[PDB]
Design a protein around this ligand. Structure first.
Ligand SMILES: C=CC1=C(C)/C(=C/c2[nH]c(/C=C3N=C(/C=C4\NC(=O)C(C)=C4C=C)C(C)=C\3CCC(=O)O)c(CCC(=O)O)c2C)NC1=O
Length: 233
């Protein structure tokens, strides 16, 4: 509370992402004055056009206070969250957003799987799992919405985009990817659901899950999908 609100506000409004993040964390611990600065920043930046990590971090930091008035104000002003909930198939992404805004990552993971089957159409909806060719033909827009929500509500630590970047970093070697994202530990495949880490202590890329029971083809088709380069992920 001895921190300088004028200077922290300026740090948030400057263009350095790394300095924005430290300012946001400090401001959120500075009562009405700091929280008011954060609320004004949201008001000036929402709805997003492109995903902006700092804006997601402001929203989620404020939600995570779990204080009545701020929660009420965020829900009234941003009833669908901070990012347009767009779909090439008219799908409803609000339940996914709500789970993510509550930091209920396990529910969000379950919803994401249901939505991908819905997106793939009647065959996938009935069998409740995907073929790699269905993934290849997903519309980019829906994948962008889904990924943006995961990324914005996890400080950039979750999302298929995050997994893709780690997969590229590993030379596209899936056997190196699994330990990096916590899906295998040496010889031990992480058991679903109890072995997974349903919070932000999880490794980067841990969520959303892609079951490996039917092999890696779905994951590879997802990571190679044109959406990522199209939207700058
Ligand atoms: C490679 C070993 C591996 C095994 C033995 C495995 C088994 C497995 N995973 C399941 C579900 C599931 N398993 C996962 C995810 C995982 N589960 C894991 O063991 C791992 C490593 C992940 C990776 C994220 C998910 C999300 C489900 C529920 C969705 C689905 O049934 O596809 C089921 C239940 C299928 C059913 O009831 O119809 C089995 C038998 N999955 C695997 O990937």
């Amino acid at each position: 509370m001895s921190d300088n609100l004028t200077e922290l506000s300026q740090q948030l409004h400057d263009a350095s992402e790394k300095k924005q993040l430290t300012a946001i964390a400090a401001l959120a611990e500075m009562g009405e004055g700091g929280q008011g600065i954060l609320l004004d920043y949201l008001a000036k930046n929402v709805p997003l056009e492109k995903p902006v990590l700092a804006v997601g971090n402001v929203y989620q930091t404020l939600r995570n206070l779990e204080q009545e008035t701020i929660t009420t104000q965020l829900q009234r002003n941003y009833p669908t969250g901070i990012f347009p909930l767009q779909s090439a198939q008219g799908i409803d992404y609000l339940p996914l957003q709500e789970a993510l805004g509550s930091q209920d990552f396990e529910t969000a993971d379950e919803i994401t799987r249901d939505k991908l089957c819905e997106l793939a159409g009647p065959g996938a909806s009935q069998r409740q799992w995907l073929y790699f060719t269905e993934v290849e033909k997903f519309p980019a827009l829906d994948l962008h919405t889904i990924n943006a929500l995961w990324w914005l509500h996890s400080n950039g630590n979750f999302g298929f985009s995050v997994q893709r970047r780690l997969w590229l970093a590993s030379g596209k070697e899936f056997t190196k990817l699994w330990p990096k994202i916590g899906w295998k530990s040496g010889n031990v495949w992480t058991r679903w659901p109890k072995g997974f880490t349903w919070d932000l202590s999880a490794p980067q890329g841990h969520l959303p899950l892609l079951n490996q029971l039917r092999g890696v083809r779905v994951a590879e088709s997802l990571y190679r999908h044109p959406v990522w380069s199209q939207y700058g992920w």
